Design a protein around this motif. Structure first.
Motif, PDB file in Angstrom:
ATOM      1  N   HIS A 193     -10.496  -2.491  -0.247  1.00  0.00           N
ATOM      2  CA  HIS A 193      -9.867  -1.622  -1.239  1.00  0.00           C
ATOM      3  C   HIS A 193     -10.751  -1.382  -2.471  1.00  0.00           C
ATOM      4  N   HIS A 194     -11.359  -2.440  -3.039  1.00  0.00           N
ATOM      5  CA  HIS A 194     -12.103  -2.322  -4.300  1.00  0.00           C
ATOM      6  C   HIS A 194     -13.553  -1.850  -4.132  1.00  0.00           C
ATOM      7  N   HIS A 195     -14.160  -1.998  -2.950  1.00  0.00           N
ATOM      8  CA  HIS A 195     -15.506  -1.462  -2.738  1.00  0.00           C
ATOM      9  C   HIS A 195     -15.495  -0.022  -2.234  1.00  0.00           C
ATOM     10  N   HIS A 196     -14.505   0.343  -1.417  1.00  0.00           N
ATOM     11  CA  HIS A 196     -14.243   1.727  -1.031  1.00  0.00           C
ATOM     12  C   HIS A 196     -13.841   2.531  -2.266  1.00  0.00           C
ATOM     13  N   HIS A 197     -13.769   1.851  -3.403  1.00  0.00           N
ATOM     14  CA  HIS A 197     -13.262   2.368  -4.662  1.00  0.00           C
ATOM     15  C   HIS A 197     -14.397   2.858  -5.562  1.00  0.00           C
ATOM     16  N   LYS A 232       0.836  -1.189   0.000  1.00  0.00           N
ATOM     17  CA  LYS A 232       0.000   0.000   0.000  1.00  0.00           C
ATOM     18  C   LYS A 232       0.872   1.240   0.000  1.00  0.00           C
TER      19      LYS A 232
END
Lengths: 161, 161, 161, 161, 161, 161
Positions: E157-161, D69
């Motif tokens: 990471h990918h849903h907060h995206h 990260k």
């Protein structure tokens, strides 16, 4: 006959807590010991104030700060001294002992001696245990009784007016 | 609950250092360790105030001035008492403990106790190497934490103001 | 860095000397040494202030007066305590140690300790002749350094102003 | 001469923490050990990131995630291995040892080895104690010094531009 | 603080299982325990991928394919090494440790280590009964937790995206 | 999480006390300790209901009425069983345990167990002094906490209503 004593209801009181973080192996236990007896004797905790310092040495100067605020009724000494060095156990224990005492006579505010002076590590294992002789439990209660007492003294003065 | 403790950043802080030159072979060792930890924890070394005196006795009266400066936030007690003269070690060392104690309680300004009590000189030299029992290292660190603590205490009072 | 110390010149300075008259056999010898260091180390004797008293008990009360006059910069405490009566050497000597101490810390004025604790007249004679061991001589030296030191503290205070 | 080292101020840094929950009897102690040294060295904790896994085996793969990260400057290894099985202590300790090492050379990001490899349960009782040799305390500090160092390396690169 | 750990629900997850058929009398015992805990913790048994190979050596190269599937979230290492051939137990077992290690670190995909290292066959049979030391039971459970963890890592990471 | 526990304020609460007069020399000792802690923890002593019976046997049937009052929030079991008659100590004491148990479970109203089981009378007298093993002291305190707890339980139901 005019008598003053104190109930143990911690309703309406805002407390002072000073804690050494030397040998925190027992300090955490006592700290919680006091907070418990406080709120489980009715007192709220948003009015409790906790200050942490390095060692037994600094507890005096801190309580002197805590007792001088208007909104602290009683202050709880907290520390553990293990006989690590005789210069530091004899001098620092008696110096804080008397030192706290003179603070109270001076600021007119009750201070409990919430110290566990253990000559050995075994006596340190006995007093933070289950028998509900958790020195923090006890000195917290002495503070509440003295808190409602000086609230009984000064109240039987201010309201009779 | 309202809790106060200090971080150890030495930034924005101006320190006091008082030094006995009785037994200077290790005293130099100490102040080095002191100013070391001060400066490494980010604080600039020009705000250090360093005062030199003869033997352990004057340690008090020096600091008492150092604190009455508005611009010294905390003072680092530094001296060595080796059993040279035992009437001088009981009375002077304990009087150092009490005298410094009561100045700090009085001025409401912290004074650490960089005091190495060695019976033998070898136990001194052994403890200034890389394990940082360099008592000054630690008395310096205590002074930082207490420094930020009273700047944490009184500043949570004057900015909330 | 800023370092404060005191040279050994007695120029521009006004001192105090307090004298007991018990065992005066040795007091003559030590005040002599004391006034030797002042006048020889740059001082004129015209401002040496000499106050005499009965026995070791009254030493404190006197110096406290010598320190409340504006124009006494340092007071040289001088007396002899010899192990006559164990009640009076233990309690009275520590009361001098402490009594002088809290004097100087309160008044912010250096007072030095020229008190010879000896067990025999022969230990006094040894130190009186030429052995460079007149303890009043040393107390006069330490107080000179503190005087010029506090002149160095207080003068670097008022001149930078 | 161009020198780089690090102060210990945790101001501005966002940290990585991986913890095994095998023998949590010591892991809780160290975990707190690191968080303490972080925030008590000025660092905020909303930027610390903690990930928990089953056992020592998985610590590699996790740190590899944490170091990738953008917003993690340094990562703290955390685990305790007690000699439970020699296949698992020799292989898993050296495999994670080298494994973490190669992560760091590879992601160019500092990893501290916050492991307590105790041959016995008694050595496990010594290192999570009071002497302030709380392996988490220490490896947390190594990470801050290395955090400000690579911030000193890459800053003395990026800003000089 | 931002903390990540995994629950153990096997719902929505597709698993990898690699199996050596060296010492099959207990290997069947293991995969049973494996798929057992998988399916009981709610996950469907049709998304299991189960691959069979000869002896312990090929264990790596199989999994390396299994992981490079987009749709296998984690892989369960399963094999038994009994001291049959000691050159084959030192080199093959340790190479199993490292080889699997580096595949997981490389693909950033977890691989558990269902490896039973028995010297005697009786210590194997004793540990698959109801106390669930059925090493597959546990290696399965670790894989679930890590599975949900990386689906917890990369999905935060990918849903907060 | 939703957690319920009781403070110990006796204010606004009306209590039950049932007393056997078998062995009254210590029974008086107990109820004193009981009503003591009740009243000191702030609750008024006129809401006490105190019922006297012969021997330990009727202890149940008394309380069963006391609870069926709407206005008794909790009841304090008080009696002494000394080994006088062993058929009477096994059957009556255990039947006291069960009978009180099932009344409390049935009425959903707490009943404490102020029961001193002494073999010798000296172990009784020793435990009513200032260490507060005055079993009534404690059975009283348990009743307070449970009192406020069910008033905490059902009132967090009827006011949220």
């Amino acid at each position: 006959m005019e008598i003053y004593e104190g109930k143990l209801t911690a309703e309406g009181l805002r407390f002072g807590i000073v804690a050494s973080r030397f040998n925190h192996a027992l300090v955490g236990r006592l700290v919680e010991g006091a907070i418990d007896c406080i709120v489980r004797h009715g007192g709220r905790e948003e009015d409790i104030t906790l200050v942490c310092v390095p060692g037994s040495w600094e507890i005096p100067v801190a309580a002197g700060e805590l007792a001088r605020k208007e909104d602290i009724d009683a202050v709880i000494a907290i520390g553990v001294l293990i006989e690590g060095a005789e210069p530091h156990f004899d001098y620092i224990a008696s110096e804080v002992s008397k030192g706290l005492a003179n603070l109270s006579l001076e600021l007119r505010k009750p201070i409990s001696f919430g110290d566990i002076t253990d000559d050995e590590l075994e006596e340190a294992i006995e007093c933070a245990g289950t028998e509900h002789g958790n020195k923090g439990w006890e000195a917290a209660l002495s503070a509440i009784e003295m808190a409602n007492l000086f609230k009984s003294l000064r109240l039987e003065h201010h309201h009779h007016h």
